[PDB]
């Protein structure tokens, strides 16, 4: 039936000019040696992702969709949602967002610039004057940097982005905004992901697997997720959408972004030329995040239905979907999984590899991340979050003359602060370059990196400066990351750790704060980590 787009053969350009490497990478020649497999996607693979995204789809539901919609509608009813003064999108606009056609950007929008809010004011009149008109969107190809995966067949293709003019891209939040911070919560209670912590996602895992008296749990995906979404999907959502209690300015504003936008669409390329045209989901829009999860959503749970999975509990981000629910033996549960992914399949959303069913926590993969346990101070199983570290080490070795990693190195200790791979590698590596620097107390992204402690225990707990006896996979797996990268095992972190640890110490104040909390594991003698007042 509907086929998710359609070429001009016209060329995908680049905005921001791909950046060439460099014969030395200083800040991440000690960090790993194997720079030649740290790459970042070209512009010019943008052709070969859209074979990967153009098929034809079809779709085909039944009872248990229809009633899994049903019970979504009546949850979207007891919503009501507001319409939101032109100004007041404007001002939630990104600071860097791509500038207007029409000659002005974010600094005027946020600013509230008289020619800004003149068009933001006729766009969003004509989107009530018109319900119609296909709106033009832009497409261009995301650059992300990545580690070579032989298996997984070299280099993967850069990621398309399609997105309207900024104006359009206000009026879309005066409409919608309102909808995005009230809707997915209120059609999906606990199981939506975004409403979680890291720290709060693992205790939510593994409250749902130990309330199954006999527990299994999956995890589903599909990488192309925006291209199995069907122009009824989305006229599904304004269904869902309208469900609420509503402003009858939103509602048409809706309808009509809906029809002109969300449904499909012209895509130009930045030199101009006509590119191709779209009949599956826009990357690049409001309702991109808020349409997935929705959508995913009920797909899903009426597949749960068709399979006969019993006491399912979920977790959505998106395309990213985890299912914990009671066994009926190995031989039904294999069964019932390939039922749920037949459905999904006529649902429209059929996966990469295939589910299988685990029965132990620690191997399913929620949100390119997965809990794993280690040993606390006081020698109790603690449980975490974590990954594999190919990716953020790629990303920590790559510099250009206009980019620099020390951001991502920040990012990731932050975030995965209590993994075996943050703590011995990212971490004394982080520290020992900003100690030669000598520019410790510099603020990156808006972090003192003097804090981190405080940051730390107040985001993960103290127990976090404490783990020991991490598992087999995850010990396994981090040997592994470090010999593919050329990194140097964390035998050698251990020692240039209880060196970077003496400095920090030497230093005084709240650098050996850093030098005490954040590496008493590297010492033969803990020291005993109280708690820390900054933390409250």
Request: net charge positive; hydrophobic share 35%; with cysteine.
């Amino acid at each position: 039936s509907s086929m998710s787009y359609s070429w001009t053969g016209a060329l995908i350009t680049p905005c921001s000019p791909e950046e060439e490497k460099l014969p030395i990478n200083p800040l991440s020649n000690s960090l790993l040696r194997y720079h030649n497999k740290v790459y970042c996607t070209t512009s010019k693979s943008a052709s070969q992702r859209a074979k990967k995204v153009t098929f034809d789809r079809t779709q085909v539901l039944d009872a248990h969709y229809d009633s899994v919609l049903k019970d979504i509608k009546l949850a979207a009813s007891k919503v009501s949602a507001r319409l939101l003064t032109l100004q007041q999108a404007c001002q939630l606009t990104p600071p860097h967002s791509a500038r207007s056609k029409y000659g002005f950007g974010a600094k005027e929008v946020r600013s509230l610039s008289g020619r800004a809010v003149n068009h933001i004011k006729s766009v969003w009149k004509d989107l009530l004057e018109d319900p119609q008109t296909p709106i033009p969107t832009t497409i261009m190809a995301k650059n992300e940097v990545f580690c070579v995966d032989p298996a997984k067949g070299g280099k993967k293709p850069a990621r398309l982005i399609v997105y309207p003019d900024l104006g359009v891209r206000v009026c879309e939040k005066m409409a919608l905004y309102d909808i995005t911070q009230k809707l997915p919560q209120a059609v999906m209670g606990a199981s939506y992901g975004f409403q979680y912590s890291p720290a709060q996602r693992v205790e939510y895992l593994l409250k749902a697997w130990a309330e199954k008296k006999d527990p299994m749990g999956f995890s589903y995906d599909t990488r192309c997720f925006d291209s199995t979404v069907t122009e009824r999907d989305i006229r599904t959502e304004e269904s869902i959408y309208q469900a609420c209690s509503l402003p009858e300015e939103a509602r048409t504003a809706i309808h009509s972004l809906t029809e002109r936008l969300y449904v499909g669409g012209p895509m130009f390329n930045s030199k101009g030329q006509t590119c191709g045209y779209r009949r599956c989901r826009a990357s690049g829009v409001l309702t991109t995040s808020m349409g997935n999860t929705i959508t995913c959503y009920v797909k899903a749970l009426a597949a749960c239905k068709a399979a006969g999975i019993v006491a399912p509990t979920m977790l959505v981000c998106g395309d990213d979907l985890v299912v914990i629910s009671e066994s009926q033996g190995t031989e039904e549960d294999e069964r019932n999984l390939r039922a749920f992914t037949e459905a999904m399949t006529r649902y429209s959303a059929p996966p990469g590899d295939p589910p299988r069913p685990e029965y132990d926590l620690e191997l399913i993969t929620s949100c390119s991340s997965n809990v794993s346990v280690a040993l606390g101070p006081r020698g109790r199983r603690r449980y975490y979050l974590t990954r594999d570290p190919t990716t953020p080490l790629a990303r920590a070795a790559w510099e250009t003359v206009r980019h620099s990693p020390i951001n991502s190195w920040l990012g990731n200790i932050i975030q995965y602060a209590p993994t075996i791979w943050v703590r011995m590698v990212l971490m004394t590596h982080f520290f020992s370059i900003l100690m030669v620097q000598d520019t410790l107390d510099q603020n990156l992204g808006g972090v003192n990196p003097l804090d981190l402690p405080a940051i730390i225990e107040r985001l993960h707990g103290l127990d976090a400066f404490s783990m020991h006896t991490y598992s087999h996979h995850e010990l396994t797996r981090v040997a592994s990351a470090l010999r593919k990268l050329g990194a140097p095992p964390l035998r050698v972190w251990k020692s240039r750790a209880r060196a970077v640890r003496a400095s920090l110490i030497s230093r005084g104040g709240k650098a050996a704060v850093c030098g005490r909390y954040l590496f008493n594991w590297a010492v033969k003698t803990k020291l005993k980590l109280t708690p820390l007042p900054e933390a409250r």
